[PDB]
Ligand binder design. Structure first.
Ligand SMILES: CN1C(=O)c2ccccc2NC(=O)[C@H]1Cc1ccccc1
Ligand SMILES: O=C(O)CCC(=O)C(=O)O
Ligand SMILES: [Fe+3]
Length: 287
């Protein structure tokens, strides 16, 4: 029983309901091949100079990822394609406003390119967020998902090169005795396709068995604005921020945020006024 594959345009309204039901879905052509090309070109060197996740020079080493994983986040200052095309993706936002309407505004918890070296082993089956947001474990099991993860293929995902594994329905599992690779299916994707899961979906990167291919993805963890992002844009240069749309600015923490509470008093406000209003933050200004 395989992962449901949906069209990004034809099937748009069906994507989140599918994920909310089965815990994963494949969005075909989530990003056009042109945007994939530009993303790749724009991140390439930063991937090449990224060290091992737990590198001794980092003051927040990542000990969980394998030393053959490279992860580069805070993509806005690196990539025009990301901060213009990806952050304003209309598919991304209809899915996110579908999934999060119960909670209110959403933003990027983390936008990151992961490239896995040849023969990178499968990851352990996991739920995301358990090394950053322990509060999530304390949610009632039927609480609506507070973050979701777009795993976007920047190169081909094949069974042989390590395409991600998911366990269908595992986002509703409380008893974990059922957990094992036996229960998984694969996300077979062309570049630009995206695998979409929730923070409860049990999944892992697969084993790279060709010993040659280098697999690369863009993982966009979108979450309610009530949860703190894994990454900071505080250091992104103001001229970059002001080149963006207001929507993009909000997604990066450069705007105030709102809950869905009918009388919402808002998040990250300043004496009752927004960040952008207070700071007179320009938008969509070219560089
Ligand atoms: C540790 N870890 C990340 O680094 C990560 C990377 C990209 C996007 C999300 C993300 N979030 C996480 O919670 C996890 C995923 C994980 C990976 C291997 C083993 C166990 C868990
Ligand atoms: O490598 C993959 O395909 C998935 C990686 C993943 O799920 C994670 O890093 O949390
Ligand atoms: Fe993961």
């Amino acid at each position: 029983s395989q992962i449901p594959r949906l069209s990004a345009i034809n099937d748009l309204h069906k994507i989140w309901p599918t994920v909310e039901e089965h815990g994963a879905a494949i969005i075909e052509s989530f990003l056009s091949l042109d945007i994939v090309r530009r993303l790749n070109e724009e991140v390439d060197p930063f991937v090449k100079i990224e060290p091992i996740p737990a590198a001794k020079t980092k003051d927040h080493p990542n000990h969980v990822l394998s030393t053959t994983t490279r992860l580069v986040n805070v993509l806005a200052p690196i990539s025009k394609a990301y901060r213009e095309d990806v952050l304003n993706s209309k598919v991304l936002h209809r899915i996110c406003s579908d999934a999060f309407h119960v909670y209110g505004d959403y933003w990027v918890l983390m936008g990151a390119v992961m490239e896995l070296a040849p023969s990178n082993p499968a990851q352990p089956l996991h739920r995301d967020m358990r090394f950053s947001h322990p509060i999530v474990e304390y949610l009632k099991p039927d609480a609506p998902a507070t973050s979701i993860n777009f795993l976007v293929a920047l190169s081909p995902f094949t069974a042989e090169n390590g395409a991600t594994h998911v366990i269908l329905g595992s986002h509703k599992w409380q008893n974990l005795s059922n957990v094992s690779m036996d229960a998984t299916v694969r996300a077979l994707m062309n570049p630009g396709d995206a695998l979409l899961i929730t923070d409860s979906t049990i999944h892992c990167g697969g084993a790279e068995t060709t010993g040659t291919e280098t697999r690369r993805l863009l993982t966009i963890t979108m979450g309610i604005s009530q949860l703190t992002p894994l990454e900071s844009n505080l250091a992104v240069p103001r001229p970059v921020i002001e080149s963006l749309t207001p929507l993009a600015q909000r997604l990066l923490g450069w705007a105030s945020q709102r809950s869905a509470a009918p009388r919402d008093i808002g998040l990250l406000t300043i004496r009752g006024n927004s960040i952008e209003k207070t700071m007179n933050l320009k938008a969509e200004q070219p560089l």
